Design a binder for this molecule. Structure first.
Ligand SMILES: CC(=O)OCc1ccccc1
Ligand SMILES: [Cl-]
Length: 162
């Protein structure tokens, strides 16, 4: 297991524009296109991202390319964030994957309310952090995925993805 395999499991792979769990236009391995209700707006974002006129459909190679860019962007966003970087650098590699997973799903703003969870993770109070992480809109709206990520933080193993 690695972050790419983990997120590929959590996000799936679809080569035509679809709606994510929140109803937003998405493609590939969970690449958000837009929060606008306009399919044309989503198609424009797609063409801009791929560099050609796609009319809502991409290849597997293109999906994987976008996915690599998106994972890298999540990592670099963590490393540029004064709140997240110290916590990230305190973690082992398996738990760093759980961290990237959350940023990929919710972005830096989506994790802003997790200050207490972040402190517990930095303190390595894993069971306490797991309890706190579940007290969230995130867990309630995507509980199976959140449970996998939380188990990864709790145990430091890949057991939830095996
Ligand atoms: C904020 C959160 O709970 O997950 C994202 C994260 C976690 C630890 C370090 C960096 C980002
Ligand atoms: Cl879920």
């Amino acid at each position: 297991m690695n972050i790419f395999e983990m997120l590929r499991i959590d996000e799936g792979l679809r080569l035509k524009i679809y709606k994510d769990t929140e109803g937003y236009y998405t493609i590939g391995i969970g690449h958000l296109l837009t929060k606008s209700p306009s399919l044309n707006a989503a198609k424009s974002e797609l063409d801009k991202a791929i560099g050609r006129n796609c009319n809502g459909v991409i290849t597997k190679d293109e999906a994987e390319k976008l996915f690599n860019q998106d994972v890298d962007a999540a990592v670099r966003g963590i490393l540029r964030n004064a709140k997240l970087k110290p916590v990230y650098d305190s973690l082992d590699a398996v738990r760093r994957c759980a961290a990237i997973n959350m940023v990929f799903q919710m972005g830096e703003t989506g994790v802003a309310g997790f200050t207490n969870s972040l402190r517990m993770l930095q303190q390595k109070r894993w069971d306490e952090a797991a309890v706190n992480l579940a007290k969230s809109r995130w867990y309630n709206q995507t509980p199976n995925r959140a449970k996998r990520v939380i188990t990864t933080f709790r145990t430091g193993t890949w057991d939830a993805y095996k």
